[PDB]
Design an enzyme around this catalytic site. Structure first.
Site, short mmCIF file in Angstrom:
data_model
loop_
_atom_site.label_atom_id
_atom_site.label_comp_id
_atom_site.label_asym_id
_atom_site.label_seq_id
_atom_site.Cartn_x
_atom_site.Cartn_y
_atom_site.Cartn_z
N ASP A 35 17.08 -90.52 2.32
CA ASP A 35 16.57 -91.09 3.57
C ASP A 35 15.18 -91.69 3.35
O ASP A 35 14.17 -90.98 3.32
CB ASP A 35 16.48 -89.98 4.61
CG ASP A 35 15.98 -90.43 5.95
OD1 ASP A 35 15.92 -91.68 6.14
OD2 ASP A 35 15.68 -89.57 6.81
N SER A 198 9.58 -109.00 8.31
CA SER A 198 10.53 -110.08 8.04
C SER A 198 9.99 -111.37 8.63
O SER A 198 9.36 -111.39 9.70
CB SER A 198 11.88 -109.73 8.63
OG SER A 198 12.80 -110.82 8.56
#
Ligand code: THR
Length: 329
Positions: A35, A198
């Site tokens: 994770d 992004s």
């Protein structure tokens, strides 16, 4: 040194991925959920309340190398509301042939119901930054942080499969595992995550919209969670899709052929195939399918979870100034 381990979806939907981890001496093999959105290595154990165990357990008293970390305790909760807590051992931990000595192994005294109910996951191996570790009074380092001194390069890579096995590598970049080149992008560790921005997105064969989407690379999250306006733009191109208040997100007809979704990494582009965005039927035999792209508004952070990451070869560069790399594959 290096390591290389196979990671496998837990179920037919790619809800999560498990990777074998060897703990203790002689090794006890557990299947852990790697994770990158958390920073604790915790396991079901001989200490876990028996009624809450359904999983393979770690027994510290059977490991010659286990040491109790005196006075240390831990307690964690995740975004889905699941939780666990317990005490702490240090022990030898190996992943894919890469061995770390003195790794903190957080032994659960108790686990929440969602963990009990999932027979396939024996615990979590956190790969976010060690500042998120929940051990008190002194936080403990992640497996990756402990490995860096010995690794051939202070990196790990995630190559998750679409309904297929994949690979976590430590210490090297497999140039045969991706196409084109890797584009790197800056990471902020201010919140303890692999957080990046992004450069924008496109839906299907439409235009790329330049827009800063701050989010985290999180292998422990199933879906792609993006801003409400971005998600609405995507599902606008799916004629049967609607938001369902009762199901909890966008649903659409399973027979639809979904558009791709492209996200920007600098000047580079990662294309998520439409099929990856079809998460699965809401129930077996349903005509309705749940979307793999959902709004982040309820979470408060954008999350590049498995739906996105499995479309890429992802490099977690853990140099002193960390960066994130993405390549097509
Ligand atoms: C970091 C870990 O504790 C968890 N993912 C959370 O943010 O609650």
């Amino acid at each position: 040194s290096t390591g290389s381990a196979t990671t496998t979806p837990i179920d037919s939907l790619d809800d999560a991925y498990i990777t074998p981890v060897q703990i203790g001496t002689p090794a006890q093999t557990l299947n852990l959920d790697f994770d990158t959105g958390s920073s604790d290595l915790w396991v079901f154990s001989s200490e876990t309340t028996a009624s809450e165990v359904x999983q393979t357990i770690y027994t510290p008293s059977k490991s010659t190398t286990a040491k109790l970390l005196s006075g240390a305790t831990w307690s964690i909760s995740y975004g889905d509301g699941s939780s666990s807590s317990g005490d702490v051992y240090t022990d030898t931990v190996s992943v894919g042939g890469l061995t770390v000595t003195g790794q903190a192994v957080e032994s659960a005294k108790k686990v929440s119901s969602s963990f009990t109910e999932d027979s396939t996951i024996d615990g979590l191996l956190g790969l976010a930054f060690s500042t998120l570790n929940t051990v008190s009074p002194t936080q403990q380092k992640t497996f990756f942080d402990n490995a860096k001194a010995s690794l051939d390069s202070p990196v790990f890579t995630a190559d998750l499969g679409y309904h297929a096995p994949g690979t976590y590598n430590f210490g090297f970049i497999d140039t045969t595992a991706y196409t084109g080149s890797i584009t790197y992008t800056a990471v902020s560790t201010k919140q303890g995550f692999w957080e990046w921005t992004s450069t924008g997105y496109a839906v299907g064969s439409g235009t790329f919209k330049s827009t800063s989407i701050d989010g985290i690379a999180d292998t422990g999250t199933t879906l792609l969670y993006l801003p409400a306006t971005v998600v609405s733009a995507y599902w606008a191109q799916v004629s049967g899709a609607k938001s369902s208040s009762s199901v909890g997100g966008y649903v659409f007809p399973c027979s639809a052929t979904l558009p791709s979704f492209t996200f920007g990494v600098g000047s580079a582009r990662i294309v998520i195939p439409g099929d990856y965005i079809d998460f699965g039927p809401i129930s077996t035999g349903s005509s309705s399918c749940f979307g793999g792209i959902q709004s982040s508004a309820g979470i408060g952070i954008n999350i590049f979870g498995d739906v996105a990451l499995k479309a890429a070869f992802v490099v977690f560069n853990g140099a002193t100034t960390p960066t994130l790399g993405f390549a097509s594959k």
